[PDB]
């Protein structure tokens, strides 16, 4: 992969100060693809932070809008994130990713952990599910007419321990590039479903649904942990 | 940090072919610091692959030497690894790290997973140890006169779930920059010991002891999983 994104910054940020990160991209222009920021607090789901698109138009998670600024420098291929008035609740791995016209959020950086410390809105998924080698497994995601209902702007991600999400299915049904076809997506009203046939040992991971939402936001589900039953 | 290292290469290699990776460094010269390669097969201990130093002098893991070549391009800040005659047993996350004069293997790349597929010398550690918040805990590593007994060339690493090792201790004692001082290391004949006083929640990880050997090979231990007992 020549397309890549890398987050950079100072992790440790004292409470009440501003947290500032830079995402440096290579192998493509921000004038052709959007860039988004996602975070994941140690031991939580994925939360959308905000996005900046080709024309520089920006979009923010309403819960964070209070202290968020996203900017960009075209010449240096950089996208900046500033988060003000940081507290311990902003401790997280911060991820940037690309958002493309026809391939979905396909490429993500590796993630940068930021710890905030001093002296030393709703998509529902079953939290767990399991199946054995060879058989199929379904993971459902419930929302509403604003989002999963609004139409076919549903994504599914895979995340293994300590690692950036990998896009599986975008447009609710379309398989991303390089994704094996034992993965498929469907949608029915306010519900979207991922199906994994021919379960494999390496499918054991957490799974996240995400959906566009009427107020130009992006919402993630609560995550589903999949376990595979072997014979070993 | 300014210092960073990044592995880059193909997606998957076919068996009996040549796996080739490139390590690009930034924030320092290979003419000032050595570069080493380490790998980690799924669910398995760290294994040293080989090293190239400031004068280009190379050193290899005897078990892999047969099909190993490490090269470098100084003008471009690159170090190259070639592994021939790959089989399924070479599937692994490959890591490239810096070896310094006075700071140990302090900085490591993020790791690149490489799987070898078609269309379908000994350091002993206990496998587990555990403790509640605040207590001290010890992890022991046995070898021999060639290695842990050779002298004070012992390191300790920490690895969380899907992440590059972090150096804790070097010189069999000297703690590393930025490492908190509840970690200490001691040595007593053919045995080296890492002690963590005041166990913290984020110490929950695997721990590896590595040692220089007589034959200028680096050897890693079998790994120790440390669990912390909450009240949750």
Coordinates of N, CA, C and O in Angstrom, one line a residue, chain B residues 7-129:
Chain B
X7 N 8.5 -0.3 8.4 CA 8.6 -1.5 7.4 C 7.6 -1.3 6.3 O 6.5 -0.7 6.5
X8 N 8.0 -1.8 5.1 CA 7.1 -1.6 3.9 C 7.5 -2.7 2.9 O 8.7 -3.0 2.7
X9 N 6.5 -3.4 2.3 CA 6.7 -4.5 1.4 C 5.5 -5.0 0.7 O 4.5 -4.2 0.6
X10 N 5.4 -6.2 0.2 CA 4.2 -6.7 -0.5 C 3.1 -7.2 0.4 O 3.2 -7.1 1.7
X11 N 2.0 -7.7 -0.1 CA 0.8 -8.2 0.7 C 1.1 -9.6 1.2 O 1.3 -9.8 2.4
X12 N 1.2 -10.5 0.2 CA 1.4 -12.0 0.6 C 2.5 -12.6 -0.4 O 2.5 -12.2 -1.6
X13 N 3.3 -13.5 0.1 CA 4.3 -14.0 -0.7 C 4.0 -15.5 -0.9 O 3.4 -16.2 0.0
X14 N 4.3 -16.1 -2.1 CA 4.1 -17.5 -2.3 C 5.2 -18.3 -1.8 O 6.4 -18.0 -1.8
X15 N 5.0 -19.6 -1.3 CA 6.0 -20.4 -0.7 C 7.2 -20.6 -1.7 O 7.0 -20.6 -2.9
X16 N 8.4 -20.8 -1.2 CA 9.6 -21.1 -2.0 C 10.0 -19.9 -2.8 O 10.9 -20.0 -3.7
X17 N 9.4 -18.7 -2.5 CA 9.8 -17.4 -3.2 C 10.7 -16.6 -2.2 O 11.1 -17.2 -1.1
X18 N 10.9 -15.3 -2.5 CA 11.7 -14.5 -1.6 C 10.9 -13.3 -1.0 O 10.5 -12.5 -1.8
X19 N 10.7 -13.3 0.3 CA 10.0 -12.3 1.0 C 11.0 -11.1 1.2 O 12.1 -11.4 1.7
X20 N 10.7 -9.9 0.7 CA 11.5 -8.7 0.7 C 10.8 -7.5 1.4 O 9.7 -7.1 0.9
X21 N 11.4 -7.0 2.4 CA 10.9 -5.8 3.1 C 11.9 -4.7 3.1 O 13.1 -5.0 3.0
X22 N 11.4 -3.5 3.3 CA 12.3 -2.4 3.4 C 11.9 -1.6 4.6 O 10.7 -1.5 4.9
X23 N 12.9 -1.2 5.3 CA 12.8 -0.4 6.5 C 13.3 1.0 6.2 O 14.5 1.2 5.8
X24 N 12.4 2.0 6.3 CA 12.8 3.4 6.0 C 13.0 4.1 7.4 O 12.1 4.0 8.2
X25 N 14.2 4.7 7.6 CA 14.3 5.4 8.9 C 14.3 6.9 8.8 O 14.5 7.4 7.7
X26 N 13.9 7.6 9.8 CA 13.8 9.1 9.9 C 14.2 9.6 11.2 O 14.0 8.9 12.3
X27 N 14.8 10.8 11.3 CA 15.3 11.4 12.5 C 16.7 10.8 13.0 O 17.1 11.1 14.1
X28 N 17.3 10.0 12.1 CA 18.7 9.6 12.5 C 19.3 8.8 11.3 O 18.5 8.4 10.4
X29 N 20.6 8.7 11.3 CA 21.4 8.0 10.3 C 21.7 6.6 10.6 O 22.0 6.2 11.8
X30 N 21.7 5.7 9.6 CA 22.0 4.3 9.9 C 23.6 4.2 10.1 O 24.1 3.3 10.7
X31 N 24.3 5.3 9.7 CA 25.7 5.4 9.9 C 26.0 5.8 11.3 O 27.1 5.7 11.8
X32 N 25.0 6.1 12.1 CA 25.2 6.4 13.5 C 24.5 5.3 14.4 O 25.1 5.1 15.5
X33 N 23.4 4.6 14.0 CA 22.8 3.6 14.8 C 22.5 2.4 13.9 O 22.1 2.4 12.7
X34 N 22.7 1.2 14.6 CA 22.3 -0.1 14.0 C 20.8 -0.3 13.8 O 20.0 0.5 14.3
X35 N 20.4 -1.2 13.0 CA 19.0 -1.5 12.7 C 18.9 -3.0 12.7 O 19.7 -3.7 12.2
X36 N 17.9 -3.5 13.5 CA 17.7 -4.9 13.5 C 16.2 -5.3 13.1 O 15.4 -4.4 13.1
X37 N 16.1 -6.6 12.8 CA 14.8 -7.1 12.4 C 14.4 -8.2 13.4 O 15.2 -9.0 13.7
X38 N 13.1 -8.1 13.8 CA 12.6 -9.1 14.7 C 11.3 -9.6 14.1 O 10.6 -8.8 13.3
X39 N 10.9 -10.8 14.3 CA 9.6 -11.3 13.8 C 8.9 -12.0 14.9 O 9.5 -12.5 15.9
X40 N 7.6 -12.1 14.7 CA 6.7 -12.7 15.6 C 5.5 -13.4 14.8 O 4.7 -12.7 14.3
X41 N 5.6 -14.7 14.8 CA 4.5 -15.5 14.3 C 3.3 -15.5 15.2 O 3.4 -15.3 16.4
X42 N 2.1 -15.7 14.6 CA 0.8 -15.6 15.4 C 0.8 -16.4 16.7 O 1.1 -17.6 16.6
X43 N 0.6 -15.7 17.8 CA 0.6 -16.4 19.1 C 1.9 -16.9 19.6 O 1.9 -17.8 20.5
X44 N 3.0 -16.4 19.0 CA 4.3 -17.0 19.4 C 5.3 -16.0 19.9 O 5.1 -14.8 19.7
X45 N 6.4 -16.4 20.5 CA 7.5 -15.5 21.0 C 8.1 -14.8 19.9 O 8.2 -15.2 18.7
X46 N 8.7 -13.6 20.3 CA 9.7 -12.8 19.5 C 10.8 -13.7 19.0 O 11.4 -14.5 19.8
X47 N 11.3 -13.5 17.7 CA 12.5 -14.2 17.3 C 13.4 -13.2 16.5 O 12.9 -12.4 15.7
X48 N 14.6 -13.1 16.9 CA 15.6 -12.3 16.3 C 15.8 -12.8 14.9 O 16.0 -14.0 14.7
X49 N 15.8 -11.9 13.9 CA 16.1 -12.3 12.5 C 17.5 -12.0 12.1 O 18.2 -12.8 11.7
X50 N 17.9 -10.7 12.3 CA 19.3 -10.3 12.0 C 19.5 -8.9 12.2 O 18.6 -8.2 12.5
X51 N 20.8 -8.4 12.1 CA 21.1 -7.0 12.3 C 22.1 -6.4 11.3 O 22.9 -7.2 10.8
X52 N 22.0 -5.1 11.1 CA 23.1 -4.5 10.3 C 23.5 -3.2 11.1 O 22.7 -2.3 11.4
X53 N 24.8 -3.1 11.3 CA 25.4 -2.0 12.1 C 25.9 -0.8 11.3 O 25.6 -0.7 10.1
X54 N 26.6 0.1 12.0 CA 26.9 1.4 11.5 C 27.9 1.3 10.3 O 27.8 2.0 9.3
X55 N 28.7 0.3 10.4 CA 29.7 0.1 9.3 C 29.1 -0.9 8.2 O 29.9 -1.4 7.4
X56 N 27.8 -1.3 8.3 CA 27.3 -2.2 7.4 C 27.6 -3.7 7.7 O 27.2 -4.6 7.0
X57 N 28.2 -3.9 8.8 CA 28.5 -5.3 9.2 C 27.2 -6.0 9.6 O 26.5 -5.4 10.4
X58 N 27.0 -7.2 9.0 CA 25.8 -7.9 9.3 C 26.0 -9.1 10.2 O 27.1 -9.6 10.3
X59 N 24.9 -9.5 10.8 CA 24.8 -10.6 11.8 C 23.5 -11.3 11.6 O 22.5 -10.6 11.5
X60 N 23.4 -12.6 11.7 CA 22.2 -13.3 11.4 C 21.9 -14.4 12.5 O 22.8 -14.8 13.2
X61 N 20.7 -14.7 12.5 CA 20.1 -15.7 13.3 C 20.5 -17.0 12.7 O 20.1 -17.3 11.6
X62 N 21.4 -17.9 13.3 CA 21.9 -19.1 12.7 C 20.8 -19.9 12.1 O 21.0 -20.4 11.0
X63 N 19.6 -20.1 12.7 CA 18.6 -20.9 12.1 C 18.0 -20.4 10.8 O 17.4 -21.2 10.1
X64 N 18.2 -19.1 10.4 CA 17.6 -18.5 9.3 C 18.7 -18.1 8.3 O 18.5 -17.8 7.1
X65 N 20.0 -18.1 8.8 CA 21.1 -17.6 7.9 C 20.9 -18.1 6.5 O 21.0 -17.3 5.5
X66 N 20.7 -19.5 6.4 CA 20.7 -20.1 5.0 C 19.9 -19.2 4.0 O 20.5 -19.1 2.9
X67 N 18.8 -18.7 4.3 CA 18.0 -17.9 3.3 C 17.8 -16.5 3.7 O 16.8 -15.9 3.4
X68 N 18.8 -15.9 4.3 CA 18.7 -14.5 4.8 C 19.8 -13.6 4.1 O 20.9 -13.9 4.0
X69 N 19.3 -12.4 3.7 CA 20.3 -11.4 3.2 C 19.8 -10.0 3.8 O 18.7 -9.6 3.6
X70 N 20.7 -9.3 4.5 CA 20.3 -7.9 4.9 C 21.2 -6.9 4.2 O 22.4 -7.1 4.3
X71 N 20.7 -5.8 3.6 CA 21.5 -4.9 2.9 C 21.2 -3.5 3.3 O 20.2 -3.3 4.1
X72 N 21.9 -2.5 2.8 CA 21.4 -1.1 3.2 C 21.8 -0.1 2.1 O 22.9 -0.3 1.5
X73 N 20.9 0.9 1.9 CA 21.2 2.1 1.1 C 21.2 3.3 2.0 O 20.1 3.9 2.4
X74 N 22.4 3.8 2.3 CA 22.6 4.9 3.2 C 22.1 6.3 2.7 O 21.5 7.1 3.4
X75 N 22.3 6.5 1.4 CA 21.8 7.8 0.8 C 20.3 7.9 1.0 O 19.8 9.0 1.2
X76 N 19.6 6.8 0.9 CA 18.1 6.8 1.1 C 17.6 6.5 2.5 O 16.5 6.3 2.7
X77 N 18.5 6.2 3.4 CA 18.1 5.8 4.8 C 17.3 4.5 4.7 O 16.2 4.5 5.2
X78 N 17.7 3.5 4.0 CA 16.9 2.3 3.9 C 17.8 1.1 4.3 O 19.0 1.0 4.0
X79 N 17.1 0.1 4.9 CA 17.6 -1.2 5.3 C 16.6 -2.2 4.7 O 15.4 -2.1 4.9
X80 N 17.2 -3.2 4.0 CA 16.5 -4.2 3.3 C 16.7 -5.6 3.8 O 17.8 -5.9 4.2
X81 N 15.6 -6.3 3.9 CA 15.7 -7.7 4.3 C 15.1 -8.5 3.1 O 14.1 -8.1 2.5
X82 N 15.8 -9.6 2.8 CA 15.4 -10.6 1.9 C 15.4 -12.0 2.6 O 16.5 -12.4 3.2
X83 N 14.3 -12.7 2.6 CA 14.2 -14.0 3.1 C 13.7 -14.9 2.0 O 12.7 -14.7 1.4
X84 N 14.6 -15.9 1.6 CA 14.4 -16.9 0.5 C 13.6 -18.1 1.0 O 13.6 -18.4 2.2
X85 N 13.1 -18.8 0.1 CA 12.5 -20.2 0.2 C 11.5 -20.2 1.3 O 11.4 -21.1 2.1
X86 N 10.6 -19.1 1.4 CA 9.6 -18.9 2.4 C 8.7 -20.1 2.4 O 8.4 -20.6 1.3
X87 N 8.2 -20.5 3.6 CA 7.1 -21.4 3.7 C 6.2 -20.8 4.7 O 6.4 -19.7 5.3
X88 N 5.1 -21.6 5.0 CA 4.1 -21.2 6.0 C 4.7 -20.8 7.3 O 4.1 -19.9 8.0
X89 N 5.8 -21.4 7.7 CA 6.5 -21.1 9.0 C 7.1 -19.7 9.0 O 7.6 -19.3 10.0
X90 N 7.2 -19.0 7.9 CA 7.7 -17.7 7.9 C 6.6 -16.6 8.0 O 6.9 -15.4 8.0
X91 N 5.4 -17.0 8.1 CA 4.3 -16.1 8.3 C 4.4 -15.4 9.7 O 4.5 -16.0 10.7
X92 N 4.4 -14.0 9.7 CA 4.8 -13.4 11.0 C 4.6 -11.9 10.9 O 4.5 -11.3 9.8
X93 N 4.5 -11.2 12.0 CA 4.7 -9.8 12.0 C 6.2 -9.5 12.1 O 6.9 -10.0 13.0
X94 N 6.7 -8.7 11.1 CA 8.1 -8.4 11.0 C 8.3 -6.9 11.5 O 7.6 -6.0 11.0
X95 N 9.3 -6.8 12.4 CA 9.5 -5.5 13.1 C 11.0 -5.1 12.7 O 11.9 -5.9 12.8
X96 N 11.2 -3.8 12.5 CA 12.6 -3.2 12.3 C 12.8 -2.2 13.4 O 12.0 -1.3 13.6
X97 N 13.9 -2.3 14.2 CA 14.2 -1.5 15.4 C 15.6 -1.0 15.3 O 16.5 -1.5 14.7
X98 N 15.8 0.1 16.1 CA 17.1 0.7 16.2 C 17.9 0.1 17.4 O 17.3 -0.1 18.4
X99 N 19.2 -0.1 17.1 CA 20.1 -0.5 18.2 C 21.1 0.6 18.4 O 21.7 1.0 17.4
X100 N 21.2 1.2 19.6 CA 22.0 2.4 19.8 C 23.2 2.1 20.6 O 23.3 1.0 21.2
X101 N 24.2 3.0 20.6 CA 25.3 2.9 21.5 C 25.0 2.8 23.0 O 25.4 2.0 23.7
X102 N 24.1 3.8 23.5 CA 24.0 3.9 24.9 C 22.5 3.8 25.4 O 22.2 4.2 26.5
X103 N 21.5 3.5 24.5 CA 20.1 3.6 24.9 C 19.4 2.3 24.6 O 18.2 2.2 24.8
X104 N 20.1 1.3 24.1 CA 19.5 0.0 23.9 C 18.6 0.0 22.7 O 18.5 1.0 22.0
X105 N 17.9 -1.1 22.4 CA 16.9 -1.1 21.3 C 15.7 -0.3 21.7 O 14.7 -0.9 22.2
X106 N 15.8 1.0 21.7 CA 14.8 1.9 22.2 C 13.7 2.1 21.2 O 12.5 2.2 21.6
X107 N 13.9 2.1 19.9 CA 12.8 2.6 19.0 C 12.5 1.5 18.0 O 13.4 1.0 17.4
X108 N 11.2 1.1 17.9 CA 10.8 0.0 17.0 C 9.7 0.5 16.1 O 8.9 1.3 16.5
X109 N 9.7 0.0 14.8 CA 8.6 0.2 13.9 C 7.3 -0.4 14.4 O 7.3 -1.1 15.4
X110 N 6.3 -0.2 13.6 CA 5.0 -0.6 14.1 C 4.6 -2.1 13.8 O 3.7 -2.6 14.5
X111 N 5.4 -2.6 12.8 CA 5.2 -4.0 12.5 C 4.4 -4.2 11.2 O 3.4 -3.5 11.0
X112 N 4.8 -5.1 10.3 CA 4.1 -5.4 9.1 C 3.8 -6.9 9.1 O 4.7 -7.7 9.2
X113 N 2.5 -7.3 9.0 CA 2.2 -8.7 8.9 C 2.4 -9.2 7.5 O 2.0 -8.6 6.6
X114 N 3.1 -10.4 7.4 CA 3.3 -11.0 6.2 C 2.9 -12.5 6.4 O 3.4 -13.2 7.3
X115 N 2.1 -13.0 5.4 CA 1.6 -14.4 5.5 C 2.2 -15.1 4.2 O 2.1 -14.5 3.1
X116 N 2.7 -16.3 4.4 CA 3.1 -17.1 3.2 C 2.0 -18.1 2.8 O 1.8 -19.0 3.6
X117 N 1.4 -17.9 1.7 CA 0.3 -18.7 1.3 C 0.1 -18.9 -0.2 O 0.4 -18.0 -1.0
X118 N -0.4 -20.1 -0.6 CA -0.9 -20.4 -1.9 C -2.5 -20.6 -1.8 O -3.0 -20.2 -0.8
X119 N -3.1 -21.1 -2.9 CA -4.5 -21.4 -2.9 C -5.0 -22.5 -2.0 O -5.6 -23.5 -2.5
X120 N -4.8 -22.4 -0.7 CA -5.0 -23.5 0.2 C -3.7 -24.3 0.3 O -3.4 -24.9 1.4
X121 N 20.9 -21.6 22.6 CA 20.1 -20.7 21.9 C 18.7 -20.6 22.6 O 17.7 -20.3 22.0
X122 N 18.7 -20.7 24.0 CA 17.5 -21.0 24.7 C 17.4 -20.1 26.0 O 18.3 -20.2 26.9
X123 N 16.3 -19.3 26.1 CA 16.0 -18.5 27.3 C 14.6 -18.9 27.8 O 13.6 -18.7 27.1
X124 N 14.5 -19.3 29.1 CA 13.3 -19.8 29.7 C 12.7 -18.8 30.7 O 13.4 -18.3 31.6
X125 N 11.4 -18.6 30.5 CA 10.6 -17.8 31.4 C 9.3 -18.6 31.8 O 8.8 -19.2 30.9
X126 N 8.8 -18.4 33.0 CA 7.5 -18.9 33.3 C 6.4 -18.4 32.4 O 6.5 -17.3 31.8
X127 N 5.3 -19.1 32.2 CA 4.4 -18.7 31.2 C 3.4 -17.6 31.7 O 2.8 -17.0 30.9
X128 N 3.4 -17.4 33.0 CA 2.4 -16.5 33.6 C 2.9 -16.0 35.0 O 3.7 -16.7 35.7
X129 N 2.4 -14.8 35.3 CA 2.5 -14.3 36.6 C 1.4 -13.4 36.8 O 0.8 -13.0 35.7

